[PDB]
Design a binder for this molecule. Sequence first.
Ligand SMILES: Nc1ncnc2c1ncn2[C@@H]1O[C@H](COP(=O)(O)O)[C@@H](O)[C@H]1O
Ligand SMILES: Nc1ncnc2c1ncn2[C@@H]1O[C@H](COP(=O)(O)O)[C@@H](O)[C@H]1O
Ligand SMILES: Nc1ncnc2c1ncn2[C@@H]1O[C@H](COP(=O)(O)O)[C@@H](O)[C@H]1O
Ligand SMILES: Nc1ncnc2c1ncn2[C@@H]1O[C@H](COP(=O)(O)O)[C@@H](O)[C@H]1O
Ligand SMILES: O=P(O)(O)OC[C@H]1O[C@](O)(CO)[C@@H](O)[C@@H]1O
Ligand SMILES: O=P(O)(O)OC[C@H]1O[C@](O)(CO)[C@@H](O)[C@@H]1O
Ligand SMILES: O=P(O)(O)OC[C@H]1O[C@](O)(CO)[C@@H](O)[C@@H]1O
Ligand SMILES: O=P(O)(O)OC[C@H]1O[C@](O)(CO)[C@@H](O)[C@@H]1O
Ligand SMILES: [Mg+2]
Ligand SMILES: [Mg+2]
Ligand SMILES: [Mg+2]
Ligand SMILES: [Mg+2]
Ligand SMILES: [Mg+2]
Ligand SMILES: [Mg+2]
Ligand SMILES: [Mg+2]
Ligand SMILES: [Mg+2]
Lengths: 327, 327, 327, 327
Amino acid sequence: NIVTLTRFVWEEGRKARGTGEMTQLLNSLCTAVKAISTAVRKAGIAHLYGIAGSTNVTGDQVKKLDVLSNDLVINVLKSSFATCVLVSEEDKNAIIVEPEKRGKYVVCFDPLDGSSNIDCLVSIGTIFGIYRKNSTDEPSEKDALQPGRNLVAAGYALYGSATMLVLAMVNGVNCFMLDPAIGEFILVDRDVKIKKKGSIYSINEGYAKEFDPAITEYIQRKKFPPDNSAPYGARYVGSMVADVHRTLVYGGIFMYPANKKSPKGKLRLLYECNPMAYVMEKAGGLATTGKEAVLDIVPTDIHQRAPIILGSPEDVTELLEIYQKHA
Amino acid sequence: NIVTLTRFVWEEGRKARGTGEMTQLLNSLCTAVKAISTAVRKAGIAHLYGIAGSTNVTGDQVKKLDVLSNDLVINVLKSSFATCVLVSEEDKNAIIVEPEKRGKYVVCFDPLDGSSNIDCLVSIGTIFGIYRKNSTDEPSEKDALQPGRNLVAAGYALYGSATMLVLAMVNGVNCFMLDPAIGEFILVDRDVKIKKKGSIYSINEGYAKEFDPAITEYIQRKKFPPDNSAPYGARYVGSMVADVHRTLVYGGIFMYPANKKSPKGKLRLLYECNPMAYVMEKAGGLATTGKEAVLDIVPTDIHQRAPIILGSPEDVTELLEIYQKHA
Amino acid sequence: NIVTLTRFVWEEGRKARGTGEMTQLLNSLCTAVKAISTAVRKAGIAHLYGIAGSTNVTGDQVKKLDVLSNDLVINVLKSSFATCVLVSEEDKNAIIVEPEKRGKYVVCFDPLDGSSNIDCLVSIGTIFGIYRKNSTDEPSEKDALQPGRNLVAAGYALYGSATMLVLAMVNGVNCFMLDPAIGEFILVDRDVKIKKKGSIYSINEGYAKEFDPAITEYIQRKKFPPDNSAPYGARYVGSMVADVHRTLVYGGIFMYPANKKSPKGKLRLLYECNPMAYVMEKAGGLATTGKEAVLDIVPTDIHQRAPIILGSPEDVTELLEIYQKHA
Amino acid sequence: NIVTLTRFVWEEGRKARGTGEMTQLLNSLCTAVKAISTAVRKAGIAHLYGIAGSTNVTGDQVKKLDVLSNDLVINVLKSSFATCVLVSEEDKNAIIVEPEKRGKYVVCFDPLDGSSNIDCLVSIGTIFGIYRKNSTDEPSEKDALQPGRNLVAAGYALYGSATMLVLAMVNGVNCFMLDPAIGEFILVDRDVKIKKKGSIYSINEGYAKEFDPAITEYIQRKKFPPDNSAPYGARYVGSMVADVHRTLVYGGIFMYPANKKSPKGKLRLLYECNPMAYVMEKAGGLATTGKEAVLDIVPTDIHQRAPIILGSPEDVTELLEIYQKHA
Ligand SMILES: Nc1ncnc2c1ncn2[C@@H]1O[C@H](COP(=O)(O)O)[C@@H](O)[C@H]1O
Ligand SMILES: Nc1ncnc2c1ncn2[C@@H]1O[C@H](COP(=O)(O)O)[C@@H](O)[C@H]1O
Ligand SMILES: Nc1ncnc2c1ncn2[C@@H]1O[C@H](COP(=O)(O)O)[C@@H](O)[C@H]1O
Ligand SMILES: Nc1ncnc2c1ncn2[C@@H]1O[C@H](COP(=O)(O)O)[C@@H](O)[C@H]1O
Ligand SMILES: O=P(O)(O)OC[C@H]1O[C@](O)(CO)[C@@H](O)[C@@H]1O
Ligand SMILES: O=P(O)(O)OC[C@H]1O[C@](O)(CO)[C@@H](O)[C@@H]1O
Ligand SMILES: O=P(O)(O)OC[C@H]1O[C@](O)(CO)[C@@H](O)[C@@H]1O
Ligand SMILES: O=P(O)(O)OC[C@H]1O[C@](O)(CO)[C@@H](O)[C@@H]1O
Ligand SMILES: [Mg+2]
Ligand SMILES: [Mg+2]
Ligand SMILES: [Mg+2]
Ligand SMILES: [Mg+2]
Ligand SMILES: [Mg+2]
Ligand SMILES: [Mg+2]
Ligand SMILES: [Mg+2]
Ligand SMILES: [Mg+2]
């Protein structure tokens, strides 16, 4: 028996006795992701470039891709009827859903992540996190400011060589590969577990001059092992979604620590760090700032940043013990 | 006035006064590339997972994406009628073409490069180079041992967020985007030129402990600019096709130098290094082992390796100077 | 707000307070239909024809299309968990679903209809009818033998110039167009109503010599109107699904009356006539044998045939009154 | 050994000693055909219905499939560099090509035929014919008034259950299936020949009351064979492209004779009748007005109509005899 994304969420929803609202919300993400995937893959681009003449639009319009993604995501989510608040990376303010379309779920998302790789055609993706609304108050920003630990579902779509959607929930992590011939995601990996230990480390070493001594020491150790084993390989694609997926699936460690340009980290906590930390923990892995668990942080700004270290438990831990040794 | 790959090749053929044999060869390759693209993006994956039933099969028994790619290329090329010898990464020996199907061209390719990335869905590609056959004697392996300087055409397809075909000939480098809705590459970037100086460096820093002193000095300068300029950023996807493409388009440098466990470099001369050296030079860049232009090596074995450093002219030149300083 | 098939069935299901089982069953048809559509449209056919060599399958296998369709349909339905009995046109016996996968719904279907048009590439389609199981007995054939009037949902997919899925239920008829770029059906026509009267008649006149006098008289009247208006146009595609859809959407009348080769009609009652009659009545139209309503017939053979006349009410009626005038 | 349309055209070009101008012309058409196909099958229809938002628009304001088709064809042909005059169904006057873009070929086409079928999703097609330019004077409309006998190439694309391109030249008719997964037509039927005698007749029987006596006699014989043979079956899709294709492949006859409200027939000479007459004759069939081979008419107006009867040689001959018997 083959399992499709659609069927899988449905089955899970019954097991959990849902009213179906969260299930429709998930079905809606899928749609969004398929629509983004098709755009990213450049289908229909011959029109932009004149295959039918440059007479095609009467006035002004073409779209950047992340603008489009954002529109797809927002619009599909509202149409779901499952949400009351949304937080996009592209909006200075939480969007609040009209009462007619208002469900009970808060959704944080990065509609298109890894934009310095968009032009060079490198892997890019979409990041999401779902919360249940925890107040009887009219829906506002505060509803989005919960710790990642209160997540009900999270995950990401990866537009790589193929398109994959990874979904994490209370019971674990599942991967579905998009079949673009029939528009259906297919469970291809079930209940995924990251290796305890890894052989790849992933960090942008260009900030070498600004790392703290923990990260400096750890990096040396990945390259000149004290036990004299083979040094870790290094991979940094530059798209968080890509680097984290490879981390999930081959194991190892991903790092985006604090900097002078950012002393608080670069990556966003609501819609980059959190969901990626939820996925890592559901899969037997760790996600820390160096000092504490990403999921336990209570945000104050929807666009707050945080340092993030995630990956195999022995690897992350090894770095936590350096921070400890140092403090 | 939209220019598709087929038209462009056709015209370039006219200007060259071609017999039309090479043009057909290139048309053939486009077709191989669109076919691999669809396979890589997993159209019809649902059949492999029993959508239609017939579910005994999913086991370690069926054709890998890398093997499929190879077959597509060999067959689509032979069917061209323009080739007499092919070299593939995936075969110990050059394939001699059937006298009946024979043509003058010699083709070296890597049907699918970046196979450490395959399972994690990161970008992967196809690299190729085309030579004119030098001797009059029967077609034999040694027809492929010609230095890169002799390349009549060379380039690659990147399967990334989108699929792209980059093609370099005597008079420049051009980029064509695959519109998978119609099966057609659209020229999106004409006569491409790499910038003189980038701000990104690409290398696997995990081999730090095997690096020669110049590579070592070089990295340091990128991190701690002795002149106080901004430090370069780092990127290493792990797929040559992707790292190189980014280098073409954003500028900067890409390096797979010799190291102790790879005393000759790891990347293959005939179908990885030469193809990308040719693109880089046709685009105003450099490609060097550290002591010598890659294109000038006289090859001695079809699977020979070479150290390769390629990218923007100023960034390669700076490194070469370091190499000179280490006499 | 755009409505997708998925969302539409969901919304309807809640309104009707379903446990969701019938809703998953519908979601499962969709999938099946997308999969059939992609096959029919010939995607991936380059493999059959050797694009990768004729070395591709080790032993014996390619599939006819209606065989495939059948496998898709059966397998997707079982996987739904919504069914206990299925009746395919391709199976001499009702399939009975294993108790582990056994839902409460009986499904009758023609997996691929219009097969004399398959080779000439004319429009083809899939026909379905859903019943609720009406016994507390272990599920057997008798569960499929209900009159069309006990239908809970029915409809068809059309693989024409575009692919459309038409769905009828207690409350009416809705059309969704397949967007093959993102694999999603889009409500494009809502609550469809056939015209009271039409200007097209549709019958295979080649059986002229064997019609009864009712049909003979009616045909003359469509061609030499007694009121002297313009004669109806004639259309017979040869695929029931195509002729009936055009009937639904432009109005008029479709006929496949009794014959000597068939004195009982050609078309099958469980999975051709019934669903097509349910769709016609939900849309303000009529479906008769000449003597009685198709939906009211209680079948005795799952593969029983019946005469069928359907289309605009004034048109069908005009023919009923000829039968009456004659009897 | 798989043969794609591009290869086939290329070779036929070699054998013909072509300049390669006509070959490019045909390549261009393939590209137009794949583009219309995608549009007809409704990829990206979700955008027209506000998936991405921007929902003011769906109203009677945006480009019809028929207009889009026309633009694709004109532009893709002009970009060929092989044409000096085009005739389209959709334009009152021939389009003269810009001297800069000029070539020797004259092209008559029907970008989208069967528009009464468009809304019901029944098959529709694109018909074309190519002439060599006869005079030396400036390119003008009258360059298109050449009898069909002069056609250098002719054929059509059928958008049906699958998309097909049928192409007839001096040395035969071949059929190529579009694999929309890779954007490539595959030759599936080589040197096609219509059978001598079919058992299907195609006509709009609704015009019975305007039919000339021979057509009338003819129909009767198909229904009541005076020799007691089996009666022919009837089929009339309503789209010339589909009815004709079926005629090519199953055999039999297709008829649009003159009738009183269409005293000259309805179908257009330059871009409907000639293109299909040429295919039929190159395939061993006949095409006649009833008194004269269609290809021999000297046309006098680019939108002139003609009565046309085409199909198997025995079935056309039988009808012609009836016409002779009516002196
Ligand atoms: N598809 C699903 N998968 C897993 N849990 C679900 C699903 N649907 C609902 N639930 C659980 O039930 C809770 C209430 O669902 P709902 O009743 O739709 O708001 C959710 O917050 C989930 O924890
Ligand atoms: N499409 C083309 N683009 C650029 N150069 C070409 C093309 N076709 C042929 N040539 C040049 O002309 C030489 C002979 O062409 P051919 O007769 O096809 O072998 C080739 O080796 C190329 O150097
Ligand atoms: N998606 C739906 N649309 C319309 N009616 C439905 C739907 N789902 C369930 N129902 C109605 O509720 C009945 C019981 O549904 P179920 O509880 O799924 O067996 C069905 O037989 C339908 O009449
Ligand atoms: N691809 C082709 N297939 C068949 N005949 C061709 C082809 N190309 C050219 N010809 C024949 O040669 C003539 C001159 O070709 P051209 O130089 O392309 O105008 C054409 O009018 C055709 O009759
Ligand atoms: O170039 P930098 O500073 O390493 O940042 C790249 C990071 O930025 C992001 O685009 C988020 O801004 C991530 O996808 C990625 O990890
Ligand atoms: O893991 P390493 O040693 O850095 O290798 C990366 C290189 O591996 C290769 O796959 C070797 O073919 C290249 O595509 C890529 O540049
Ligand atoms: O050629 P005939 O006898 O008119 O039958 C065609 C009919 O047969 C069917 O294929 C069902 O067998 C219908 O789709 C269609 O209406
Ligand atoms: O409805 P009628 O008069 O039979 O016309 C059918 C004919 O109409 C046309 O659309 C006229 O272009 C043809 O495609 C088709 O053969
Ligand atoms: Mg973003
Ligand atoms: Mg981001
Ligand atoms: Mg390689
Ligand atoms: Mg390889
Ligand atoms: Mg059938
Ligand atoms: Mg049938
Ligand atoms: Mg027409
Ligand atoms: Mg037209």
